[model samples]
Target: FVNQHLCGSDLVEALYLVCGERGFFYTDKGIVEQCCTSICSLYQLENYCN
Candidate 1:
């Protein structure tokens, strides 16, 4: 799956495309009850959170 190899903005872009939101969870928490964070190290994708 995408999550297995995706990192940085690649994952961020895919999250937006599927979720239509600006954020995504970086862990396998299996729940949507957290906040977005900038861990991708991409300035352009800093806003594409979680």
Candidate 2:
């Protein structure tokens, strides 16, 4: 199940930190955050951002 129903700055920062924003996150809607949402299990969120 996609556990990323909620979106926020933290995720934005984390996405940017891990994968870098722009085409990665924080767009109009074409978001790839879903990638990290499930990816959190593989990659620690704490290691991504604060």
Candidate 3:
């Protein structure tokens, strides 16, 4: 089942630190969702990618 649900945007932010904002975690939304949600949204594409 696809856990396409978000508790808060902060989750994605925390994730970007490890997986990188534009890394495999941010790009593949599914994987991000499976792991976390807050940092996923806060991740900065440009900052991570570049």
Clashing pairs in 3: 9-38, 10-38, 10-39, 11-38, 11-39, 12-38, 12-39, 12-40, 13-39
Q: Which TM-score value belongs to model 1? A: 0.32
Clashes of each: 1, 0, 9
Write one digit per residue (lDDT tens) for candidate 1, span 1-50: 23233443556455565456545444563322222232332333333444
lDDT (tens digit, per residue) of candidate 3 on 1-50? 22234432534554444356354244545444433533322334323344
Deviation of model 1 at 18, angstroms: 1.6
Query: What is candidate 3's TM-score against the reference?
Result: 0.27
Models 1 onward score TM values of: 0.32, 0.32, 0.27
lDDT of 1 at 21: 52
Estimate every model's Cα lDDT from 0 to 1: 0.41, 0.45, 0.40
Task: Say which prediction, candidate 2 or candidate 3, comes out ahead on TM-score.
Answer: 2
Candidate 2: how large is its RMSD?
7.6
Q: Assess candidate 3 and give its lDDT.
A: 0.40
lDDT winner between candidates 1 and 2: 2
